[PDB]
Protein backbone atom coordinates (compact mmCIF):
# COMPACT_ATOMS: atom_id res chain seq x y z
CA UNK A 1 0.00 0.00 0.00
CA UNK A 2 2.49 2.77 1.53
CA UNK A 3 5.10 3.64 -0.61
CA UNK A 4 8.11 6.77 -0.83
CA UNK A 5 9.07 8.16 -4.01
CA UNK A 6 12.25 9.83 -4.84
CA UNK A 7 12.66 11.32 -8.54
CA UNK A 8 16.51 10.72 -9.45
CA UNK A 9 19.29 8.56 -8.28
CA UNK A 10 22.05 11.43 -9.10
CA UNK A 11 21.07 15.36 -9.22
CA UNK A 12 23.25 17.87 -10.28
CA UNK A 13 22.62 21.83 -8.50
CA UNK A 14 25.41 24.97 -9.67
CA UNK A 15 27.38 26.17 -6.96
CA UNK A 16 25.27 28.85 -5.10
CA UNK A 17 22.09 28.16 -6.36
CA UNK A 18 18.49 26.75 -5.28
CA UNK A 19 18.38 22.97 -3.78
CA UNK A 20 15.13 21.19 -4.64
CA UNK A 21 15.09 16.79 -3.83
CA UNK A 22 11.47 15.51 -4.52
CA UNK A 23 9.71 13.51 -2.65
CA UNK A 24 6.69 11.86 -2.92
CA UNK A 25 4.22 9.43 -0.86
CA UNK A 26 1.53 7.06 -1.56
CA UNK A 27 0.07 6.30 1.79
CA UNK A 28 -3.70 7.70 1.66
CA UNK A 29 -3.94 8.92 5.37
CA UNK A 30 -0.98 11.58 5.88
CA UNK A 31 2.21 9.54 7.39
CA UNK A 32 5.03 11.44 8.92
CA UNK A 33 7.84 12.22 6.78
CA UNK A 34 11.83 12.46 7.39
CA UNK A 35 14.38 13.46 5.53
CA UNK A 36 18.10 12.17 6.46
CA UNK A 37 21.54 12.88 5.26
CA UNK A 38 24.44 11.04 4.66
CA UNK A 39 27.63 12.55 4.24
CA UNK A 40 30.51 10.74 2.92
CA UNK A 41 31.61 7.44 4.91
CA UNK A 42 29.53 8.08 7.34
CA UNK A 43 25.82 7.10 9.02
CA UNK A 44 22.04 8.87 9.19
CA UNK A 45 21.52 12.25 10.17
CA UNK A 46 18.10 13.20 10.86
CA UNK A 47 17.53 16.82 8.54
CA UNK A 48 13.93 17.56 9.55
CA UNK A 49 10.50 15.78 9.71
CA UNK A 50 7.17 16.67 9.09
CA UNK A 51 5.04 15.04 12.57
CA UNK A 52 1.34 17.34 11.93
CA UNK A 53 2.53 20.25 13.00
CA UNK A 54 3.65 23.05 11.26
CA UNK A 55 3.19 21.90 7.34
CA UNK A 56 6.08 24.61 7.07
CA UNK A 57 8.76 22.38 8.65
CA UNK A 58 12.83 23.68 9.29
CA UNK A 59 15.41 22.24 9.70
CA UNK A 60 19.12 22.70 10.17
CA UNK A 61 21.65 24.71 7.61
CA UNK A 62 18.53 26.62 5.81
CA UNK A 63 17.11 23.82 4.96
CA UNK A 64 13.31 23.11 4.84
CA UNK A 65 10.29 21.28 3.49
CA UNK A 66 6.56 21.77 3.02
CA UNK A 67 3.99 18.90 3.16
CA UNK A 68 1.71 19.36 0.52
CA UNK A 69 -1.13 17.01 1.13
CA UNK A 70 -2.95 17.83 -1.99
CA UNK A 71 0.28 16.99 -3.97
CA UNK A 72 1.13 14.15 -2.05
CA UNK A 73 4.85 16.07 -1.69
CA UNK A 74 7.28 16.63 0.97
CA UNK A 75 10.27 18.10 -1.36
CA UNK A 76 13.34 19.23 0.24
CA UNK A 77 14.83 22.69 -0.39
CA UNK A 78 17.95 24.71 1.11
CA UNK A 79 18.29 28.39 -0.77
CA UNK A 80 21.99 28.50 -1.63
CA UNK A 81 23.79 25.00 -2.84
CA UNK A 82 27.01 24.30 -1.26
CA UNK A 83 30.06 22.19 -1.93
CA UNK A 84 29.60 20.78 1.68
CA UNK A 85 25.88 19.76 0.47
CA UNK A 86 27.52 16.95 -1.35
CA UNK A 87 25.71 14.27 0.06
CA UNK A 88 22.78 11.31 -0.08
CA UNK A 89 19.76 12.16 0.40
CA UNK A 90 17.12 9.85 1.83
CA UNK A 91 13.23 10.93 2.46
CA UNK A 92 11.23 8.09 4.58
CA UNK A 93 7.59 7.81 5.66
CA UNK A 94 5.80 6.28 8.92
CA UNK A 95 4.14 2.95 7.64
CA UNK A 96 1.88 0.65 9.65
CA UNK A 97 1.96 2.37 13.06
CA UNK A 98 5.17 0.08 13.73
CA UNK A 99 8.17 1.54 11.39
CA UNK A 100 9.73 3.75 8.99
CA UNK A 101 10.54 2.91 5.39
CA UNK A 102 12.75 4.42 3.07
CA UNK A 103 13.03 5.88 -0.33
CA UNK A 104 15.69 5.16 -2.66
CA UNK A 105 18.18 7.74 -2.23
CA UNK A 106 19.78 10.85 -3.97
CA UNK A 107 22.74 12.24 -4.67
CA UNK A 108 23.27 15.56 -4.61
CA UNK A 109 26.51 16.70 -6.72
CA UNK A 110 27.45 20.61 -6.62
CA UNK A 111 28.82 21.78 -9.87
CA UNK A 112 31.59 24.23 -8.81
CA UNK A 113 31.50 27.90 -10.42
CA UNK A 114 34.63 27.34 -12.24
CA UNK A 115 34.75 31.14 -13.97
CA UNK A 116 38.54 30.87 -15.03
CA UNK A 117 38.73 27.61 -16.67
CA UNK A 118 42.16 25.77 -17.57
CA UNK A 119 42.01 22.56 -19.32
CA UNK A 120 44.82 20.46 -19.47
CA UNK A 121 46.02 17.16 -19.64
CA UNK A 122 49.20 16.57 -17.65
CA UNK A 123 51.48 13.39 -17.08
CA UNK A 124 52.69 12.98 -14.04
CA UNK A 125 55.43 10.10 -12.79
CA UNK A 126 55.68 7.37 -9.88
CA UNK A 127 57.77 8.92 -6.85
CA UNK A 128 59.39 5.62 -6.68
CA UNK A 129 62.00 4.42 -9.71
CA UNK A 130 59.53 4.22 -12.80
CA UNK A 131 58.33 4.11 -16.43
CA UNK A 132 55.35 4.26 -14.40
CA UNK A 133 52.94 7.14 -15.32
CA UNK A 134 49.29 8.52 -15.01
CA UNK A 135 47.42 11.26 -16.60
CA UNK A 136 45.42 13.49 -15.49
CA UNK A 137 42.76 16.22 -16.83
CA UNK A 138 42.38 18.90 -15.07
CA UNK A 139 40.66 22.13 -14.64
CA UNK A 140 37.67 22.43 -17.22
CA UNK A 141 34.43 23.44 -16.50
CA UNK A 142 31.09 22.43 -16.05
CA UNK A 143 30.62 21.77 -19.55
CA UNK A 144 32.90 19.43 -19.58
CA UNK A 145 31.96 15.52 -18.77
CA UNK A 146 34.63 12.36 -19.09
CA UNK A 147 33.51 9.03 -21.12
CA UNK A 148 35.05 5.61 -19.72
CA UNK A 149 37.59 4.32 -21.73
CA UNK A 150 37.29 1.93 -25.21
CA UNK A 151 40.35 0.31 -24.37
CA UNK A 152 40.18 -2.55 -21.93
CA UNK A 153 43.80 -1.79 -21.01
CA UNK A 154 43.11 2.11 -20.39
CA UNK A 155 41.45 2.85 -17.24
CA UNK A 156 39.77 6.15 -16.77
CA UNK A 157 38.28 7.64 -13.31
CA UNK A 158 34.89 9.38 -12.83
CA UNK A 159 35.18 13.39 -12.56
CA UNK A 160 36.05 14.48 -8.83
CA UNK A 161 36.21 17.82 -7.60
CA UNK A 162 38.64 19.09 -5.22
CA UNK A 163 38.12 21.76 -3.02
CA UNK A 164 41.61 23.66 -1.72
CA UNK A 165 40.47 25.76 1.27
CA UNK A 166 44.14 27.10 1.21
CA UNK A 167 43.15 28.94 -1.88
CA UNK A 168 39.80 29.16 -1.58
CA UNK A 169 40.09 26.97 -4.92
CA UNK A 170 37.90 24.25 -6.64
CA UNK A 171 38.73 22.05 -9.58
CA UNK A 172 37.51 19.06 -11.36
CA UNK A 173 39.55 15.82 -12.78
CA UNK A 174 39.89 12.81 -13.72
CA UNK A 175 42.30 10.13 -13.95
CA UNK A 176 43.69 7.72 -16.55
CA UNK A 177 46.43 5.11 -16.50
CA UNK A 178 47.56 1.90 -18.66
CA UNK A 179 50.29 -0.22 -18.46
CA UNK A 180 50.89 -0.42 -22.14
CA UNK A 181 53.96 1.08 -24.26
CA UNK A 182 52.11 2.77 -26.16
CA UNK A 183 49.98 4.96 -23.68
CA UNK A 184 50.55 8.87 -24.10
CA UNK A 185 48.52 11.20 -22.52
CA UNK A 186 47.94 13.24 -25.50
CA UNK A 187 45.68 10.09 -26.61
CA UNK A 188 44.29 8.94 -23.28
CA UNK A 189 41.18 10.82 -23.29
CA UNK A 190 40.07 10.56 -27.08
CA UNK A 191 37.17 9.33 -26.06
CA UNK A 192 35.59 11.81 -23.96
CA UNK A 193 34.53 15.46 -25.54
CA UNK A 194 37.43 17.91 -24.53
CA UNK A 195 37.67 21.74 -24.36
CA UNK A 196 38.80 23.09 -27.94
CA UNK A 197 41.50 24.81 -25.98
CA UNK A 198 42.89 22.11 -23.75
CA UNK A 199 46.54 22.30 -22.71
CA UNK A 200 48.82 19.42 -23.63
CA UNK A 201 52.47 20.17 -22.35
CA UNK A 202 55.14 18.75 -24.28
CA UNK B 1 20.38 4.76 22.56
CA UNK B 2 24.15 4.39 22.81
CA UNK B 3 22.81 1.90 19.75
CA UNK B 4 26.22 0.39 19.30
CA UNK B 5 26.65 -2.36 16.83
CA UNK B 6 29.42 -5.25 16.19
CA UNK B 7 31.06 -5.98 14.20
CA UNK B 8 32.20 -2.54 12.49
CA UNK B 9 34.16 -4.31 9.25
CA UNK B 10 33.79 -8.02 8.25
CA UNK B 11 34.81 -10.06 5.65
CA UNK B 12 33.31 -13.82 5.13
CA UNK B 13 33.61 -16.75 3.11
CA UNK B 14 30.44 -17.93 1.49
CA UNK B 15 28.25 -20.39 3.29
CA UNK B 16 28.93 -19.58 7.05
CA UNK B 17 26.55 -18.31 9.53
CA UNK B 18 27.48 -14.53 10.26
CA UNK B 19 26.06 -12.88 13.59
CA UNK B 20 25.81 -9.14 13.94
CA UNK B 21 25.10 -8.00 17.18
CA UNK B 22 23.16 -4.79 18.42
CA UNK B 23 23.09 -2.96 21.69
CA UNK B 24 20.93 -0.16 23.31
CA UNK B 25 20.62 1.70 26.28
CA UNK B 26 18.06 3.08 26.59
CA UNK B 27 15.65 -0.14 26.47
CA UNK B 28 13.23 1.11 23.92
CA UNK B 29 10.96 -1.46 22.78
CA UNK B 30 11.33 -0.96 19.26
CA UNK B 31 14.73 -2.32 17.72
CA UNK B 32 15.64 -2.63 13.72
CA UNK B 33 17.76 -4.24 11.53
CA UNK B 34 18.16 -2.62 7.82
CA UNK B 35 20.44 -3.23 5.46
CA UNK B 36 21.59 -0.68 2.67
CA UNK B 37 22.88 -0.99 -1.16
CA UNK B 38 23.53 1.70 -3.91
CA UNK B 39 20.02 2.82 -5.61
CA UNK B 40 17.91 0.64 -2.93
CA UNK B 41 17.97 2.74 0.33
CA UNK B 42 17.63 1.14 3.67
CA UNK B 43 15.69 -1.95 3.31
CA UNK B 44 14.02 -3.29 6.70
CA UNK B 45 15.12 -7.30 7.10
CA UNK B 46 13.49 -7.69 10.74
CA UNK B 47 12.48 -5.74 13.92
CA UNK B 48 11.22 -6.13 16.91
CA UNK B 49 8.84 -4.81 19.87
CA UNK B 50 9.49 -6.82 22.93
CA UNK B 51 11.63 -9.76 23.54
CA UNK B 52 8.86 -11.91 22.54
CA UNK B 53 7.99 -10.30 19.30
CA UNK B 54 9.79 -10.88 15.78
CA UNK B 55 8.53 -9.20 12.78
CA UNK B 56 9.83 -9.47 9.28
CA UNK B 57 10.17 -6.48 7.17
CA UNK B 58 10.76 -6.61 2.93
CA UNK B 59 14.08 -8.65 2.87
CA UNK B 60 13.83 -11.54 5.72
CA UNK B 61 14.62 -14.05 3.60
CA UNK B 62 18.36 -15.63 4.30
CA UNK B 63 18.20 -13.90 7.71
CA UNK B 64 16.96 -14.77 11.16
CA UNK B 65 17.28 -12.82 14.44
CA UNK B 66 16.61 -13.17 17.84
CA UNK B 67 15.55 -10.45 20.86
CA UNK B 68 17.65 -11.48 23.35
CA UNK B 69 16.64 -9.03 25.98
CA UNK B 70 15.28 -5.63 26.04
CA UNK B 71 18.87 -4.06 25.15
CA UNK B 72 20.11 -6.61 22.52
CA UNK B 73 18.70 -7.73 19.31
CA UNK B 74 20.67 -10.16 16.83
CA UNK B 75 21.06 -10.41 13.41
CA UNK B 76 22.12 -13.59 11.72
CA UNK B 77 23.19 -14.44 8.15
CA UNK B 78 22.24 -18.02 7.51
CA UNK B 79 24.42 -19.01 5.51
CA UNK B 80 26.11 -16.44 3.60
CA UNK B 81 25.47 -15.53 -0.02
CA UNK B 82 27.65 -12.81 -1.98
CA UNK B 83 24.27 -10.67 -2.53
CA UNK B 84 24.55 -10.50 1.39
CA UNK B 85 27.45 -8.25 0.71
CA UNK B 86 25.74 -4.80 2.38
CA UNK B 87 26.28 -2.23 4.98
CA UNK B 88 23.78 -2.87 7.85
CA UNK B 89 21.88 -0.49 10.39
CA UNK B 90 20.40 -1.35 13.31
CA UNK B 91 17.84 1.03 14.87
CA UNK B 92 15.41 1.93 17.58
CA UNK B 93 12.62 3.87 18.26
CA UNK B 94 10.88 5.65 20.92
CA UNK B 95 7.21 5.55 20.88
CA UNK B 96 6.99 8.80 18.60
CA UNK B 97 9.17 8.03 15.53
CA UNK B 98 12.36 9.18 17.42
CA UNK B 99 14.80 6.69 15.46
CA UNK B 100 18.56 6.22 16.68
CA UNK B 101 20.90 4.33 14.12
CA UNK B 102 23.44 2.48 14.84
CA UNK B 103 27.18 3.52 12.92
CA UNK B 104 26.82 0.83 10.79
CA UNK B 105 28.57 -2.71 10.05
CA UNK B 106 30.37 -3.06 6.59
CA UNK B 107 30.01 -6.72 5.42
CA UNK B 108 31.68 -8.69 2.40
CA UNK B 109 30.69 -12.18 1.46
CA UNK B 110 32.99 -13.49 -1.05
CA UNK B 111 33.41 -17.01 -2.62
CA UNK B 112 36.58 -17.82 -1.90
CA UNK B 113 39.69 -16.31 0.28
CA UNK B 114 41.76 -17.33 -2.15
CA UNK B 115 41.33 -14.59 -4.02
CA UNK B 116 41.50 -11.80 -1.20
CA UNK B 117 44.72 -9.49 -1.83
CA UNK B 118 46.01 -6.03 -0.62
CA UNK B 119 46.89 -2.86 -2.28
CA UNK B 120 49.87 -1.95 -4.30
CA UNK B 121 49.56 1.80 -3.70
CA UNK B 122 51.80 4.73 -5.63
CA UNK B 123 52.26 7.89 -5.43
CA UNK B 124 52.67 10.37 -8.47
CA UNK B 125 54.57 13.36 -7.99
CA UNK B 126 52.90 16.59 -9.70
CA UNK B 127 53.64 17.52 -13.39
CA UNK B 128 56.16 20.33 -13.99
CA UNK B 129 54.01 21.80 -16.67
CA UNK B 130 51.15 21.99 -14.21
CA UNK B 131 53.35 23.35 -11.85
CA UNK B 132 54.36 26.46 -14.21
CA UNK B 133 50.96 26.66 -15.56
CA UNK B 134 48.96 26.97 -12.38
CA UNK B 135 51.37 27.50 -9.29
CA UNK B 136 49.53 24.30 -8.08
CA UNK B 137 50.68 20.87 -7.65
CA UNK B 138 48.47 17.58 -7.87
CA UNK B 139 49.66 14.37 -6.36
CA UNK B 140 48.09 11.44 -7.35
CA UNK B 141 47.89 8.27 -5.27
CA UNK B 142 46.65 5.07 -7.29
CA UNK B 143 45.68 1.45 -4.93
CA UNK B 144 45.66 -1.26 -7.78
CA UNK B 145 45.11 -4.79 -6.95
CA UNK B 146 43.25 -5.48 -4.10
CA UNK B 147 40.09 -7.58 -3.13
CA UNK B 148 37.88 -7.44 -2.09
CA UNK B 149 36.37 -3.58 -2.40
CA UNK B 150 37.15 -2.99 0.88
CA UNK B 151 39.14 0.01 1.27
CA UNK B 152 39.34 3.76 3.42
CA UNK B 153 41.94 5.72 1.62
CA UNK B 154 43.67 9.14 3.49
CA UNK B 155 46.14 11.36 3.24
CA UNK B 156 49.09 12.32 5.64
CA UNK B 157 51.28 15.56 5.23
CA UNK B 158 53.79 16.12 7.57
CA UNK B 159 51.93 13.39 10.04
CA UNK B 160 48.70 15.10 10.13
CA UNK B 161 45.54 13.75 7.96
CA UNK B 162 44.58 16.28 5.71
CA UNK B 163 40.90 16.75 3.83
CA UNK B 164 41.82 19.76 2.43
CA UNK B 165 42.35 19.67 -1.33
CA UNK B 166 41.37 15.91 -1.55
CA UNK B 167 39.09 14.16 -4.16
CA UNK B 168 38.49 10.21 -3.77
CA UNK B 169 36.80 8.02 -7.09
CA UNK B 170 33.56 7.18 -4.79
CA UNK B 171 33.76 3.57 -6.02
CA UNK B 172 36.88 1.39 -7.27
CA UNK B 173 37.11 0.70 -10.59
CA UNK B 174 37.07 -3.30 -11.66
CA UNK B 175 40.50 -4.06 -13.40
CA UNK B 176 39.29 -7.06 -15.45
CA UNK B 177 35.47 -6.26 -15.44
CA UNK B 178 34.35 -9.21 -17.39
CA UNK B 179 35.15 -11.78 -14.20
CA UNK B 180 32.96 -12.05 -11.57
CA UNK B 181 35.90 -11.92 -8.86
CA UNK B 182 37.73 -9.08 -10.83
CA UNK B 183 40.53 -7.10 -8.56
CA UNK B 184 39.69 -3.47 -8.18
CA UNK B 185 41.81 0.41 -7.94
CA UNK B 186 41.14 3.57 -6.82
CA UNK B 187 42.59 6.52 -7.28
CA UNK B 188 42.79 10.11 -5.29
CA UNK B 189 44.13 13.21 -5.65
CA UNK B 190 45.75 16.10 -3.22
CA UNK B 191 46.13 19.31 -4.37
CA UNK B 192 49.04 21.97 -3.00
CA UNK B 193 50.21 25.30 -3.55
CA UNK B 194 53.24 24.82 -5.94
CA UNK B 195 55.56 26.86 -3.29
CA UNK B 196 54.21 24.30 -0.47
CA UNK B 197 55.19 20.63 -3.32
CA UNK B 198 58.42 22.80 -3.51
CA UNK B 199 59.53 22.56 0.06
CA UNK B 200 61.71 19.65 -0.03
CA UNK B 201 60.88 19.54 4.22
CA UNK B 202 57.26 18.56 3.76
CA UNK B 203 56.06 14.67 3.34
CA UNK B 204 53.36 13.81 1.26
CA UNK B 205 51.68 10.18 2.36
CA UNK B 206 48.44 8.01 0.75
CA UNK B 207 47.36 5.53 3.18
CA UNK B 208 45.23 3.35 2.34
CA UNK B 209 43.57 1.09 5.10
CA UNK B 210 42.68 -3.32 3.80
CA UNK B 211 39.89 -5.07 5.41
CA UNK B 212 40.78 -8.51 4.20
CA UNK B 213 41.68 -12.25 6.24
CA UNK B 214 41.92 -12.37 10.15
CA UNK B 215 44.73 -14.02 12.34
CA UNK B 216 42.03 -16.69 12.78
CA UNK B 217 41.65 -17.24 8.61
CA UNK B 218 43.74 -20.47 7.40
CA UNK B 219 46.26 -19.65 4.63
CA UNK B 220 47.41 -22.32 2.10
CA UNK B 221 49.40 -20.30 -0.74
CA UNK B 222 52.91 -18.74 -0.44
CA UNK B 223 51.93 -15.66 -1.61
CA UNK B 224 51.77 -13.43 2.16
CA UNK B 225 48.67 -13.99 3.93
CA UNK B 226 46.41 -11.21 2.66
CA UNK B 227 45.14 -9.74 6.40
CA UNK B 228 43.58 -6.50 7.27
CA UNK B 229 46.18 -3.86 6.91
CA UNK B 230 48.00 -0.57 6.03
CA UNK B 231 49.85 0.46 2.78
CA UNK B 232 51.04 3.58 2.30
CA UNK B 233 53.08 5.55 -0.02
CA UNK B 234 55.27 8.50 0.06
CA UNK B 235 56.97 11.59 -1.67
CA UNK B 236 59.50 13.92 -0.79
CA UNK B 237 58.89 18.00 -1.57
CA UNK B 238 60.89 18.49 -4.45
CA UNK B 239 62.41 21.98 -5.40
CA UNK B 240 63.81 20.17 -8.74
Known amino acids: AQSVTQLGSHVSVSEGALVLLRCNYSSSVPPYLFWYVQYPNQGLQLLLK??????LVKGINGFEAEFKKSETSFHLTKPSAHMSDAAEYFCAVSEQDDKIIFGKGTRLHILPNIQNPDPAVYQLRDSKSSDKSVCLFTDFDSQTNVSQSKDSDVYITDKCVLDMRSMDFKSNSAVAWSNKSDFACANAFNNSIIPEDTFFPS | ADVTQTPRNRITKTGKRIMLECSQTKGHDRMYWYRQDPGLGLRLIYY???????NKGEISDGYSVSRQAQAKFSLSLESAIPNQTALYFC??????????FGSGTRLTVVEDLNKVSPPEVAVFEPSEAEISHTQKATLVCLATGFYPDHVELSWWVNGKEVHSGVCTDPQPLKEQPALNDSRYSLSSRLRVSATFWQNPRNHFRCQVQFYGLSENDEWTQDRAKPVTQIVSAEAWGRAD
Open chain 2, 48 to 54: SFDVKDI
Open chain 2, 91 to 100: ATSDESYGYT
Open chain 1, 50 to 55: YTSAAT
